[PDB]
């Protein structure tokens, strides 16, 4: 049955997996540096190597300025063998995490952690690794995903993607937060191969401060932004601005409508075009 | 203080195995409980009955020559609740998706629930996609799922942002060709909802769609709204931003600017002179 | 390799037994237990592990909290164990916090809630009615969710997807029903306004129009601002169930403004109807 760890002074009851490079040499860049992992029974042996594991490796070899490290969960899918076990979360020595369910990558692929190793390991990606660290990276076959299940109960299904602005920082000692600032956006928006390179969004939704804020002032707006045909920038085309007017980002430029997609009617209370 | 070190000093890896079996030695089972970490923490003069908190390998399917599967659970335990209450809040299901369960989301009888499909086996009136399977996260919270981006300015600016990466090729081959965005890509935003018989695609939304194939000097994108009308079950294309900027409707002759009872305030326009 | 088993199959688990100093009841936040990785310097082992599982105590343990959560910590390439992260936080709540370098600092490393990070940070004053809800990442400047999206043989097509249904799975009844009105998904950005986090104040939403059924399922797209000498998110302009693109209140909203006119309008009718 169960098997213990106990500290009965009340320090604490750690389990430790030790590992060194060939010869007693540093440890190494991805080298596996320990694991847990379950073996079930087939009948009258266990399989070779566990179907369900954590992993504990290096990045970087080790040395006195680097103690990098990272960790991956690796599952089997229902009908394969351990031959097609998934690293299908990992979590990046700078500390992003990556999903990667089965169909995503290749196995060969199992030890990238980053932007910069799938750029090494696939020349042809070329995506900007200053994204690197920056959260939550999703990769699948075609249609990566996020679901938002949200049943009522007893109010209102409310599922919400929620951007949260301030000024500060959280990351050193004095920990001010303040106000948001102007040039403060969130944006929702898609980058692609050019067949070159990925680099920034071509399309998107913004939400904008449109000033910085107080507490009884706090603007907002909302731009759309597409790139054009011929063009590799990403411009504002039409926005909703903060008092609510619709309007496009630049005067004397953008159409409402052309000739085989004519608006029906309009209505607005003025008959009369103000140019 | 008191640590408990397995080591490898040929630097050969040091790993923990978890073995368990069937009843009588036969094959393990589907959502078996094939091995387990985890705190007990002490009350006085005892220790909790089970973990708190703990990291739970089970099986996926029956164990068998084809298949070896496998999936991970982690369990927490809220504070001012007892391990009853325990909420496996953490699914990392056989297919790869992750699955996120916090607190009031669940009832434990469905702490086994790994997908799509076993979700719609233990509650037979859900009806979802089960397609949608493998293709990453979930978020399941009583009525406000919710991802929260904390974006501190420090000295630049706070950009938080949800990013689509379009590609052609694949990762999954030895090939690994990568290459350039085509065109029928889209990153759609919207909701789908359950109808009374079962959930299906999504009926309102906005798209980032491409507008043609990319290379690196054109890379057209429009943005598109869709809803669903009263009575209907079609999500439409209803209004877009084109990728020469131009605001359209997304079809002719179709859909009105403006209402009886919301009318537009006033125009600016350069010319004055609606176009027909 | 090193082994539990259990033969007649039972389960085979490990634990971590740990307590407060002489005997009192484990406390908030104490290391319950771990498991973690040390690598090899040279001669030696690091001092502390370079990756980790750590198990802690989620208030003072009682007989009516035996409150625990989890959290990973890895360490970035270039970095000693000093500065190692403690990046993925599964609070007791069930929480998923996602942290990465550069975005707390590591006496913020216990966090586990926004009650916690309220707590330690006392300025920021977000809104904890929202811990329990999923997924939080916190990142300096520019916290992002990439959805990478191969073609292989079909289409690239990423996608965020509320899905709303009436009922619930908490309970032991589990009805699941239709989707109901005042349905909302919410794209939009919360801030501090020098006080406090609060709602959100510019938006894109879906909405549902309409309760649904087998034949009709209704949605509109709104999207909502706040105004200048404002706190109140309005809706301006949205799309309806009809495809009617509107302003949100009559005589309220103009279409273009002096500085930024529209180029050329394009209807079917001449005649803007008034």
Same mark, same amino acid.
């Given at each position: 049955?169960?098997?213990?760890?106990?500290?009965?002074? +009340? +320090?604490?009851?750690?389990?430790?997996?030790?590992?060194?490079?060939? /010869?007693?040499?540093? #440890?190494?860049?991805?080298?596996?540096?320990?694991?847990? +992992?379950?073996?079930?029974? $087939?009948?009258? !042996?266990?399989?070779?190597?566990? &179907?369900?594991?954590?992993?504990?490796?290096?990045?970087?070899?080790? =040395?006195? !300025?680097?103690?990098?490290?990272?960790?991956?969960?690796?599952?089997?899918?229902?009908?394969?063998? *351990?031959?097609?076990?998934?690293?299908?979360? @990992? $979590? /990046?020595?700078?500390?992003?995490?990556?999903?990667?369910?089965?169909?995503?990558?290749? =196995?060969?692929?199992? $030890?990238? @952690? =980053?932007?910069? #190793?799938?750029?090494?390991?696939?020349?042809?990606?070329?995506?900007?690794?200053?994204?690197?660290?920056?959260?939550?990276?999703?990769?699948?076959?075609?249609?990566?995903?996020?679901?938002? *299940?949200?049943?009522?109960?007893?109010?209102?299904?409310?599922?919400?993607?929620?951007?949260?602005?301030?000024?500060?920082?959280?990351?050193?000692?004095?920990?001010?937060?303040?106000?948001?600032?102007?040039?403060?956006?969130?944006?929702?928006?898609?980058?692609?191969?050019?067949?070159?390179?990925?680099?920034?969004? @071509?399309? /998107?939704?913004?939400?904008? /401060?449109?000033?910085?804020?107080?507490?009884?002032?706090?603007?907002?707006?909302?731009? %759309?932004?597409?790139?054009?045909?011929?063009?590799? =920038?990403?411009?504002?085309?039409?926005?909703?601005?903060? &008092?609510?007017? %619709?309007?496009?980002?630049?005067?004397?430029?953008? &159409?409402?409508?052309?000739?085989?997609?004519?608006?029906?009617?309009?209505?607005?209370?003025? +008959?009369?075009?103000? #140019?």
């Amino acid at each position: 049955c169960s098997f213990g760890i106990e500290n009965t002074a +009340g +320090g604490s009851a750690v389990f430790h997996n030790y590992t060194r490079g060939a /010869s007693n040499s540093v #440890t190494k860049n991805n080298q596996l540096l320990g694991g847990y +992992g379950s073996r079930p029974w $087939l009948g009258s !042996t266990y399989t070779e190597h566990s &179907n369900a594991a954590l992993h504990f490796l290096g990045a970087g070899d080790t =040395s006195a !300025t680097n103690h990098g490290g990272w960790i991956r969960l690796l599952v089997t899918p229902k009908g394969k063998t *351990i031959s097609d076990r998934v690293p299908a979360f @990992r $979590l /990046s020595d700078n500390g992003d995490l990556w999903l990667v369910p089965d169909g995503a990558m290749h =196995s060969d692929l199992g $030890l990238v @952690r =980053s932007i910069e #190793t799938l750029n090494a390991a696939v020349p042809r990606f070329n995506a900007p690794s200053i994204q690197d660290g920056r959260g939550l990276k999703i990769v699948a076959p075609q249609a990566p995903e996020i679901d938002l *299940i949200a049943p009522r109960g007893s109010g209102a299904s409310a599922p919400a993607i929620r951007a949260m602005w301030c000024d500060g920082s959280l990351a050193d000692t004095t920990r001010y937060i303040g106000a948001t600032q102007p040039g403060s956006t969130f944006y929702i928006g898609a980058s692609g191969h050019d067949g070159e390179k990925f680099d920034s969004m @071509r399309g /998107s939704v913004a939400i904008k /401060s449109a000033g910085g804020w107080g507490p009884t002032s706090t603007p907002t707006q909302v731009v %759309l932004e597409t790139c054009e045909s011929g063009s590799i =920038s990403r411009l504002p085309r039409w926005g909703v601005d903060h &008092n609510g007017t %619709l309007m496009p980002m630049a005067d004397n430029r953008y &159409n409402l409508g052309w000739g085989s997609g004519r608006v029906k009617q309009v209505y607005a209370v003025n +008959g009369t075009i103000n #140019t």
